[PDB]
C-alpha cells in the first residue's frame, strides 16, 4: 500500500501541516503503537507528538485503545484518510439533496470533525448572516430543523459517547475513558430551547455538552452507490426504469444495512403507491417494467418471491460487479483502443479461451490480436491458467488459456488511481512552488489595493498597479490558474472511479 | 600475480592470518593485508551510503556528504559485485573518535 501511504502523506501535508503528517504516516506504516515509542521513532519533541495525535483524533482519523498494563495504543485509519478526499463530493451531494443550510452544516462537521449541535448551528448562522444582507438575521430554529432532518436521514451521526464515570467503576480514573458507541441515541438530537441571531462579523452552561456529531460517510457512500446504479439503469433502458429503481432504493435504504447480498424484497403495490404522482403510470405498466427488468441479463433486480402480487428484490452486489466491469472495459478501451476492448470483453464473457478462438470470435487478423493480448498481460489485466499435461510444466506441452480476474484487476486499477491522484497532487504542488515568487508578487500588488480600500482611498493608486512588470506575467498567472483548476478537476473526477472500485472490493469480501 | 614466471608475490593464506590473529599483532596484519597488498582510497556518500567517484555522488547528485575512506580493493570489488546482485551494502560512516 505504498501508493496509499503516499496519498495519505500528501493529503495530510496539504491539509494539516508537516509535524502532524509525519506522525500520521508513521502510524499508517507501523500501525498501533504507544505514544512514547512513536515519539522516539519520529524524532521530534513530545509536545508536538501530543498535538499531532490530538488534532488527528479530533477528525476521527486515529483511534486509541487500551491493552495490558493499562497502556494506550494509537492506530490510524488509512480508509478515513482516503475518504477525506471525498469532502467536495459530500458537500456537493448534501447541497443538491438539501438547502445551503445543510451544506454549511456538513462543511463545518467535516472541517472540525467533532462538534456539538449548538456550536455547529451557531457557526452555520454566523456564516449565513454574511450571505444575506439588509439587516435580516438568521435564527436557530430553521438551522436545528435542517440538522434534525439530516439526522433522521442518517447523514449525520453522534460520535461515541464516553460512559458515565460515576456509574461505571467509580474510583481511580483509567488512562483512557474507553469511549463506547450506542445505537439507541445514535441519531437522537438533544432538545435545545435556546435560540439566537448570528453576528455579521462586526468585531466590535452548554446544554448539549459532551454530545458530539460527525458526518456519516457510510450514508454518503450508500447514496453515491444508489445514484450510480440509477444513472446506469437510466443509460441502459430508460429514465422510467431509473425512477422506479430510485424509488425502490429509497424504500430499501431504511429497512437495510450498508452491506448485504440482497435487500428486503418489495411488492408491486407498495412501489406503485410510493412512486411520485408526477408520472402517469398504471399498475400494469409497473408490472411490465419490473418483469422486463427481472429478465435483464445484467441482473439488476430479481423476483425472489411471488406473494403480494409482484414481489421483487434488488441485487446490489451484482450491480456493483456490473459497474466494476463497465469501468474496467471503459479504461481498457480508452487505453488500448476499441479493438483491445473487444478482445477484453470476448475473453471476459468466455471464461477461458485461447488465441485461435479469440481470433475466430473477434475477427481480428493475426499479428495484432496476440499483440494486444500480450500488452494486457504485461499490465496485469488478465492471468493465464496454464493447464499442464505433465507436472513438469514445460511450455511446449501445455495449453495456455486467457482469463480475466475481476477482483485482482479491480485492485490493480484502484492502486493505479491512487498513484495517479498522488502524481497529480505532486504536480500541483510543484507548479505552486516553482511559481511562488510570482504568486507573492501578485498577492502584494493586489494587497496594495486591498489595503486602505475606503479609509484614505485615493484614486491615484489605481493606475499604478498594472504599471509594474506584473502585466506580462499575468499570462503566466492565468496559465498556472487554469492548470491548477484542471488538475483539481481531474483529481475530483478520478475520485468517482476510486469510490466505485473501493465499493466493489469491499462488497466482495466476507471479513470472516 | 601468482607465479614467479609472472613476477608474482607470496600469499598470506588463511593459516597465516590465523597465526597473526593468535599473536595479536593487529597493526602488522593490517599493514600486510590492507596497506601493502590492495590499499585504495574510495569516496563514500554519507547520505545514501553508496560509493562515489572523484568526490561526487551520482545517486544524490551532491558532493557535500561525500568523504574519502581507506579500503582494500578486494572489499570494494565485493561491494560492487553485491550491488550488481541487488544486495546493496549501505555504509554509514562516522568520525574515528
Amino acid at each position: 500500500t505504498q501508493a496509499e501511504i503516499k496519498l495519505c502523506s500528501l493529503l495530510l501535508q496539504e491539509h494539516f501541516g508537516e509535524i502532524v503528517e509525519k506522525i500520521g504516516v508513521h502510524l499508517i506504516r507501523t500501525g498501533s503503537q504507544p505514544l512514547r515509542v512513536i515519539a522516539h521513532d519520529t524524532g521530534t519533541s513530545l509536545d508536538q507528538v501530543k498535538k499531532a495525535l490530538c488534532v488527528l483524533v479530533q477528525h476521527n482519523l486515529v483511534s486509541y485503545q487500551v491493552h495490558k498494563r493499562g497502556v494506550v495504543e494509537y492506530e490510524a485509519q488509512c480508509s478515513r484518510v482516503l475518504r477525506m478526499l471525498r469532502y467536495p463530493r459530500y458537500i456537493y451531494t448534501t447541497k443538491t439533496l438539501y438547502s445551503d443550510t445543510g451544506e454549511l452544516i456538513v462543511e463545518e462537521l467535516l472541517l472540525n470533525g467533532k462538534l456539538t449541535m449548538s456550536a455547529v448551528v451557531k457557526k452555520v448562522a454566523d456564516r449565513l448572516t454574511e450571505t444575506m444582507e439588509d439587516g435580516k438575521t438568521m435564527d436557530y430554529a430553521e438551522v436545528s430543523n435542517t440538522f434534525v432532518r439530516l439526522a433522521d436521514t442518517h447523514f449525520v451521526q453522534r460520535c461515541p459517547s464516553v460512559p458515565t464515570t460515576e456509574n461505571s467503576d467509580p474510583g481511580p480514573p483509567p488512562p483512557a475513558p474507553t469511549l463506547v458507541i450506542n445505537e439507541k441515541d445514535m441519531y437522537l438530537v438533544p432538545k435545545l430551547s435556546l435560540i439566537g441571531k448570528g453576528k455579521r462579523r462586526r468585531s466590535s452552561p452548554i446544554p448539549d455538552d459532551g454530545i458530539y456529531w460527525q458526518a456519516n460517510l457510510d450514508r454518503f457512500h450508500q447514496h453515491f452507490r444508489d445514484q450510480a446504479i440509477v444513472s446506469a439503469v437510466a443509460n441502459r433502458m430508460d429514465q422510467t426504469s431509473s425512477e422506479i429503481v430510485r424509488t425502490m432504493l429509497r424504500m430499501s435504504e431504511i429497512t437495510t444495512s450498508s452491506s448485504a447480498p440482497f435487500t428486503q424484497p418489495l411488492s408491486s403495490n407498495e412501489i406503485f403507491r410510493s412512486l411520485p404522482v408526477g408520472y402517469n403510470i398504471s399498475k400494469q405498466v409497473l408490472d411490465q417494467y419490473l418483469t422486463l427488468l427481472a429478465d435483464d441479463p445484467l441482473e439488476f433486480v430479481g423476483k425472489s418471491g411471488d406473494s403480494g402480487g409482484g414481489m421483487y428484490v434488488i441485487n446490489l452486489h451484482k450491480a456493483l460487479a456490473s459497474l466494476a466491469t463497465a469501468t474496467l472495459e471503459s479504461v481498457v478501451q480508452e487505453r488500448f483502443g476499441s479493438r483491445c476492448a473487444r478482445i477484453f470483453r470476448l475473453v471476459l464473457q468466455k471464461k477461458h479461451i485461447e488465441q485461435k478462438q479469440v481470433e475466430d470470435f473477434a475477427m481480428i487478423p493475426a499479428k495484432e490480436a496476440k499483440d494486444m493480448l500480450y500488452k494486457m498481460l504485461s499490465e496485469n489485466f488478465m492471468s493465464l491458467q496454464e493447464i499442464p499435461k505433465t507436472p513438469d510444466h514445460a511450455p511446449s506441452r501445455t495449453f495456455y488459456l486467457y482469463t480475466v480476474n475481476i477482483l485482482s484487476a479491480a485492485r490493480m486499477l484502484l492502486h493505479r488511481c491512487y498513484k495517479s491522484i498522488a502524481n497529480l497532487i505532486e504536480r500541483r504542488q510543484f507548479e505552486t512552488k516553482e511559481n511562488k515568487r510570482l504568486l507573492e508578487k501578485s498577492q502584494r500588488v493586489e494587497a496594495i489595493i486591498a489595503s486602505m480600500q475606503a479609509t484614505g482611498a485615493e484614486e491615484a493608486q489605481l493606475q499604478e498597479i498594472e504599471e509594474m512588470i506584473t502585466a506580462p506575467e499575468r499570462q503566466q498567472l492565468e496559465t498556472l490558474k487554469r492548470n491548477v483548476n484542471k488538475l483539481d478537476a481531474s483529481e475530483i473526477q478520478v475520485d468517482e472511479t476510486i469510490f466505485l472500485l473501493e465499493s466493489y472490493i469491499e462488497c466482495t469480501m466476507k471479513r470472516q | 600475480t601468482e607465479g614467479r614466471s609472472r613476477d608474482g608475490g607470496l600469499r598470506l593464506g588463511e593459516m597465516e592470518r590465523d597465526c597473526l590473529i593468535g599473536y595479536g599483532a593487529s597493526m602488522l596484519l593490517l599493514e600486510r593485508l590492507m596497506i601493502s597488498s590492495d590499499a585504495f582510497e574510495v569516496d563514500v556518500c554519507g547520505q545514501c551510503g553508496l560509493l562515489g567517484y572523484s568526490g561526487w555522488c551520482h545517486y544524490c547528485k551532491s558532493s557535500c556528504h561525500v568523504s574519502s575512506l581507506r579500503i582494500p580493493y578486494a572489499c570494494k570489488l565485493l561491494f560492487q559485485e553485491l550491488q550488481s546482485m541487488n544486495i546493496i551494502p549501505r555504509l554509514k560512516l562516522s568520525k574515528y573518535n
Binding site: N235, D238, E329, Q333, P365, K419, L424 | -
Partner: protein
C-alpha cells in the same frame, strides 16, 4: 471454408475494411431501429420487441444494401453481430420460437438490439497518469517525475 476461402478472406488477405463497414452498417441499422422503437412509445414490451432485430432480418437488410459482391450467409451476419456484442454496443437475447421466417435454430431465435453503454468514460482515463505507458517507472525523484512530465504538460497546455 475453414482451410481456404471464406467471405472475409480475399486472396489470402483479411479484409479489415470490409468487416469494419459491415459493423458500422449493422450498428447504424440497429441504432435506427432502437430510435424508432423509443419514439413509438406505444408500450414498454412492444418497444423492446420492436427494438429487437432478428439475425435473418439484418441479414436480408445487408443483402439489400449490397456493399460487397461476395454472398454473405446468415451465420456470417451472426458472427458480425457477435463481434459487435463483444464491442459493448449491442445486446442479444435468445427467445423461444418454434418456426417462422428464420427457421435457423430449433425452437430458438436470436434477437439483437442497440443498447447504450453502462456508464460514461471513467475518471481515471481523463488523467494522463491512467493512460501512461511508462506508468510503472514513475517516481518522485528521477528522470521520470510528475514535476517534469511531458504528458501532463501537453495535457494542461491543450
Amino acid at each position: 471454408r475453414s482451410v481456404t476461402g471464406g467471405a472475409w478472406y480475399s486472396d489470402q488477405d483479411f479484409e479489415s475494411e470490409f468487416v469494419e463497414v459491415l459493423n458500422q452498417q449493422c450498428f447504424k441499422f440497429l441504432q435506427s431501429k432502437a430510435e424508432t422503437a423509443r419514439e413509438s412509445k406505444q408500450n414498454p414490451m412492444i418497444q423492446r420487441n420492436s427494438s429487437f432485430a432478428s439475425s435473418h432480418e439484418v441479414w436480408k437488410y445487408i443483402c439489400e444494401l449490397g456493399i460487397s459482391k461476395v454472398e454473405l450467409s446468415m451465420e456470417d451476419i451472426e458472427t458480425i453481430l457477435n463481434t459487435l456484442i463483444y464491442d459493448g454496443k449491442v445486446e442479444m437475447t435468445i427467445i423461444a420460437a418454434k418456426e417462422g421466417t428464420v427457421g435457423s435454430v430449433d425452437g430458438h431465435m436470436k434477437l439483437y438490439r442497440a443498447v447504450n453503454p453502462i456508464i460514461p468514460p471513467t475518471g481515471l482515463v481523463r488523467a494522463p497518469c491512467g493512460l501512461c505507458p511508462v506508468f510503472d517507472d514513475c517516481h518522485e525523484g528521477g528522470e521520470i517525475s510528475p514535476s517534469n512530465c511531458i504528458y501532463m504538460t501537453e495535457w494542461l497546455e491543450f
